[PDB]
Amino acid sequence: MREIVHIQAGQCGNQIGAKFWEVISDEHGIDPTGSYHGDSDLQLERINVYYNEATGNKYVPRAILVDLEPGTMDSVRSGPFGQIFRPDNFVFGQSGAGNNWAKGHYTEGAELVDSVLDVVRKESESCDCLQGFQLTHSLGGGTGSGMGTLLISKIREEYPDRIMNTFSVMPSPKVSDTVVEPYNATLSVHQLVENTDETYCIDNEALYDICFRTLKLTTPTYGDLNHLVSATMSGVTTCLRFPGQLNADLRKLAVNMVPFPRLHFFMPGFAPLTSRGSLTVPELTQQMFDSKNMMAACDPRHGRYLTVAAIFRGRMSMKEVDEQMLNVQNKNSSYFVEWIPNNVKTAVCDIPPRGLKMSATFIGNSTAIQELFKRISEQFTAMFRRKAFLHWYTGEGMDEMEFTEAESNMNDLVSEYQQYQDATAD
Amino acid sequence: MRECISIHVGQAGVQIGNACWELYCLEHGIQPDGQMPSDKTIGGGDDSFNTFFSETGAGKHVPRAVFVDLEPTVIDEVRTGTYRQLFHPEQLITGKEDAANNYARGHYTIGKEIIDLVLDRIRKLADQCTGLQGFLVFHSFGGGTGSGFTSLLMERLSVDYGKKSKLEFSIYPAPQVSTAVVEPYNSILTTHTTLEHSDCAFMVDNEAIYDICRRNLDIERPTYTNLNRLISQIVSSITASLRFDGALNVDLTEFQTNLVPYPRIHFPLATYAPVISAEKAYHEQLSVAEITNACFEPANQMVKCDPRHGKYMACCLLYRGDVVPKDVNAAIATIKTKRSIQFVDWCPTGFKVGINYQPPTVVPGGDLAKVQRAVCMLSNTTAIAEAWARLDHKFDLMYAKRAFVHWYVGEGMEEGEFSEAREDMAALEKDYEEVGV
Amino acid sequence: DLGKKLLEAARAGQDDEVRILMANGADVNATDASGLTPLHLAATYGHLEIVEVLLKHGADVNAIDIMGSTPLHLAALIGHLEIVEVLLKHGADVNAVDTWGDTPLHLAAIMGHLEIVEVLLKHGADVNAQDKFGKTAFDISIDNGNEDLAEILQK
Numbered sequence A: 001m002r003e004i005v006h007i008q009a010g011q012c013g014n015q016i017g018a019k020f021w022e023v024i025s026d027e028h029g030i031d032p033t034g035s036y037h038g039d040s041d042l043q044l045e046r047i048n049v050y051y052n053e054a055t056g057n058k059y060v061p062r063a064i065l066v067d068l069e070p071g072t073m074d075s076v077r078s079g080p081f082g083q084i085f086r087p088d089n090f091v092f093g094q095s096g097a098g099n100n101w102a103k104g105h106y107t108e109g110a111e112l113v114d115s116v117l118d119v120v121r122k123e124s125e126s127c128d129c130l131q132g133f134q135l136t137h138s139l140g141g142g143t144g145s146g147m148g149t150l151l152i153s154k155i156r157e158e159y160p161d162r163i164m165n166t167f168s169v170m171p172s173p174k175v176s177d178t179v180v181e182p183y184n185a186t187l188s189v190h191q192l193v194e195n196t197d198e199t200y201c202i203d204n205e206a207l208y209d210i211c212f213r214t215l216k217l218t219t220p221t222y223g224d225l226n227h228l229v230s231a232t233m234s235g236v237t238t239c240l241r242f243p244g245q246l247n248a249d250l251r252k253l254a255v256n257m258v259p260f261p262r263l264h265f266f267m268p269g270f271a272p273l274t275s276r277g278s279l280t281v282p283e284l285t286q287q288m289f290d291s292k293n294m295m296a297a298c299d300p301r302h303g304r305y306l307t308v309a310a311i312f313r314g315r316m317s318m319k320e321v322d323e324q325m326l327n328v329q330n331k332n333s334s335y336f337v338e339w340i341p342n343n344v345k346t347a348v349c350d351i352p353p354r355g356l357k358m359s360a361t362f363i364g365n366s367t368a369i370q371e372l373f374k375r376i377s378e379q380f381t382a383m384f385r386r387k388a389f390l391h392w393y394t395g396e397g398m399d400e401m402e403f404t405e406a407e408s409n410m411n412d413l414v415s416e417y418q419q420y421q422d423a424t425a426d
Numbered sequence B: 001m002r003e004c005i006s007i008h009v010g011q012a013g014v015q016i017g018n019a020c021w022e023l024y025c026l027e028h029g030i031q032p033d034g035q036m037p038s039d040k041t042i043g044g045g046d047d048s049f050n051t052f053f054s055e056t057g058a059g060k061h062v063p064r065a066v067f068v069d070l071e072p073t074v075i076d077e078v079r080t081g082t083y084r085q086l087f088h089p090e091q092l093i094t095g096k097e098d099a100a101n102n103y104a105r106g107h108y109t110i111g112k113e114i115i116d117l118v119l120d121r122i123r124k125l126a127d128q129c130t131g132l133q134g135f136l137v138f139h140s141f142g143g144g145t146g147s148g149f150t151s152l153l154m155e156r157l158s159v160d161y162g163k164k165s166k167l168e169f170s171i172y173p174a175p176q177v178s179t180a181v182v183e184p185y186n187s188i189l190t191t192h193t194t195l196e197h198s199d200c201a202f203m204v205d206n207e208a209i210y211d212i213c214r215r216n217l218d219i220e221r222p223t224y225t226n227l228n229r230l231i232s233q234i235v236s237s238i239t240a241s242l243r244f245d246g247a248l249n250v251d252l253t254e255f256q257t258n259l260v261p262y263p264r265i266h267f268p269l270a271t272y273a274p275v276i277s278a279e280k281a282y283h284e285q286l287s288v289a290e291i292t293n294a295c296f297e298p299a300n301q302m303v304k305c306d307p308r309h310g311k312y313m314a315c316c317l318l319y320r321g322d323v324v325p326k327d328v329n330a331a332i333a334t335i336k337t338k339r340s341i342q343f344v345d346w347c348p349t350g351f352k353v354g355i356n357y358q359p360p361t362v363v364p365g366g367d368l369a370k371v372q373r374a375v376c377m378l379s380n381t382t383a384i385a386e387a388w389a390r391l392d393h394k395f396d397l398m399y400a401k402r403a404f405v406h407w408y409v410g411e412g413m414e415e416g417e418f419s420e421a422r423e424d425m426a427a428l429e430k431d432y433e434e435v436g437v
Numbered sequence C: 001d002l003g004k005k006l007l008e009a010a011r012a013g014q015d016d017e018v019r020i021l022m023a024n025g026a027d028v029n030a031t032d033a034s035g036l037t038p039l040h041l042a043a044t045y046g047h048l049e050i051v052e053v054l055l056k057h058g059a060d061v062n063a064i065d066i067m068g069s070t071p072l073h074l075a076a077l078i079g080h081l082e083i084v085e086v087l088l089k090h091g092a093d094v095n096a097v098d099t100w101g102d103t104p105l106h107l108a109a110i111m112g113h114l115e116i117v118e119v120l121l122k123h124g125a126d127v128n129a130q131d132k133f134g135k136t137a138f139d140i141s142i143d144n145g146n147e148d149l150a151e152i153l154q155k
Ligand SMILES: Nc1nc2c(ncn2[C@@H]2O[C@H](COP(=O)(O)OP(=O)(O)OP(=O)(O)O)[C@@H](O)[C@H]2O)c(=O)[nH]1
Pocket: B009, B010, B011, B012, B013, B015, B016, B069, B070, B098, B099, B100, B101, B102, B140, B141, B142, B143, B144, B145, B146, B147, B171, B172, B173, B174, B177, B178, B179, B180, B183, B206, B224, B227, B228, B231
């Protein structure tokens, strides 16, 4: 278990994917030309997990860039680390998806899927011990959502024994008041429940709420929201990228965090919260379990934690963390299921992220995540009851039954979270 | 003499094996390159230490040991460390992908890719033996390789070595230094499938060792290095009777005769004393009576349980160092009349005693102080059922909701195997109750 | 039958064609199979100019389709602020109720159209109107944790 193949699809996918490469290259001491200018051997130990070594001491990301709108490839290239990506790995179409899930999944997206799969095969064959795949995408658009899920299903058929992990951006009318987004999100969640092993739920509603109420930014932009997304992605991939006591990988995360196959949607959290441009151990433990620090707009005190993985970054006592973590579990005992003993794992890492001397990232599998799914479901039901813009989907080959099946599957998922929320040991 | 082959499986088995073989080298006077200046017979011999070490024509003394893991990280540390020249390189076997803390991957899917290579390499060591008595198998209960691969290996060794004894050193999980939430499942599954194939198993509770390091050695946050050093000192005291001259537990068969009255209740409790911090280099030397009394204090046990709530079926006392047999007889006499030590009515109420007059060895870099006399008590008590009950309860809490079961069923395992394994543990708890818990 | 062509012209946003068809006697209050009128279709697809021209040629501002939807319900749902104001100026019933118990306020609140929510409140939308499940627009704000929406409704 070593190599991860990163795929980024659509506008949101490529935008957050580029920020991820910028934030992790700086942490490993890799400059935009692929040269290592760091000062610690701990940066190069598991560098092969995300980077392919090339001649002349070069490190190229094992990243595949996909989109149907060609303007996205230009915006990525003009970025600071835009030239580091392998030019052969850019696979872009001529006509976009126009925020239509059916165009991404059945017509425009289906004509480019074989070309992307040839590039995926090229990177997977050059892997000594492939762990699996990591995809960044939004669920409210057309390409990341429709073509992103089709890609997941096809990659699943050729590699059924590897882990499929996604960083899925959930829509909110506070950031994009485009009314077809609940349809594209519901049709995608139906696919994600069936075909992924682990999904990090990154909600634009929570990101906007943090920026506007906590960071006091009156008109948040995508750069401000993406500042929080890149900090979360760096935090949740820390133990895949640095040695640490555990030999963490994507399969050990799934076996220990996912008790039921469909309940694989995680609520990430981060502490401290900071704005771009501009803490003791008990404050970081307290802030990690606070609703204001969650990247999904759900109150964890409305549900119960099935499993939790916490990663602390920086110089601190390992005994103080053990005491403080047990302390949070005692005062908040009613918010953890009593039928999964030792359901909280903690890890420490020496190297903190940029600017912050201390850091704490939270990964929770909580029943409160049903609040996020209930919000999308209510928006979907309001639109679908009136059959608004349904012809835009049925005209691209889709049938009405696919909408009712997706709605039924998502409501069944909410009922499944509620079932384990009310479960007792006795 | 009769040979013994040690097999170290998974991270816990390999790391404890490295600490054990380092201590064995210092006790026998073997250098890291394998040279033994005290051994006059170059190229072979019938000595006590030859049970654990073979000899080459060039005077090299090689452990009769195999290290196996499904991923290379841990065994690579052995291949590049201080004792990298001591082991046969072909007896350090590694795969590429581990069992992901999953018994089913260790036993059925990943473990199947390397089982035949491991048995062929074990056969190469067995061919070099004139009278192999059996195997010592080191592994965790909680790991995917330690649980799954060990049960597959024990199943195969029972077919290919029908009349040879098999002994285990098993690591029982603790919440303080655990790796996975599924460790209770892995522990119950490996206990079920290995029960028929193992003759005697010494469980090492990571919580018992963690507490001893904190209280006696004043280590604030013990790590695996600290735990493994103390564990290797206890394992050495148990295996000393196989590597040196003596009159008690002189072969693997005798461990079964003295500690196992019935095949299923084959889990002896080990107690060890004294454990003194190395920062107290001028500590008062404790008497035979003080160290013998310490064997009946639950705080010095290898498994957390209360022998006062149980009955004894067997009790062996293994001393090392400046111990006069008369002082042992007098200390035991006090233990019989004063204390509430109850034996079963069908066993002779008695203590078997073995004395090795060489003091215990301390490793450079360790946390233990040198002592003039030490004792390891091995007893078969019904109180060890408390350890099985604690583990069965954690299994029941998850299994009632079928939590994590899909990960096992997806890796070539039938759901029925969980209920079959659990009923076998229910019958084991009743076996201790029938004797007298 | 020009009523069938006027329905397509209002949905497509073909302003000139709508003016020609009305001049040739097309039924401004024609309905499709589901009871939708050209005004419902122009308000759903955001064609403000067609909405204004239909209202000056006898369109029933309060027409309902087979599910009780008025043009204001659909404009509030899709988020067309300018169309919402024009419909209210021409007498759209702000508290009209569809077959699911929803009012335009319930639909603007569910979809997060906060500016439309303010407009509806200023034109007398009923904060106590309950849907078929008993929920008011304020219950929707508290149930889904929308603090911005809850503040507007508490004014
Ligand atoms: N005492 C002790 N316990 C250890 C050590 N390493 C791991 N453990 C324990 O062993 C269990 C985990 O099993 P491991 O041996 O690490 O796993 P493995 O056999 O390598 O199996 P996989 O990694 O799942 O393929 C936990 O209960 C750990 O606390 C060690 O060196 N000493």
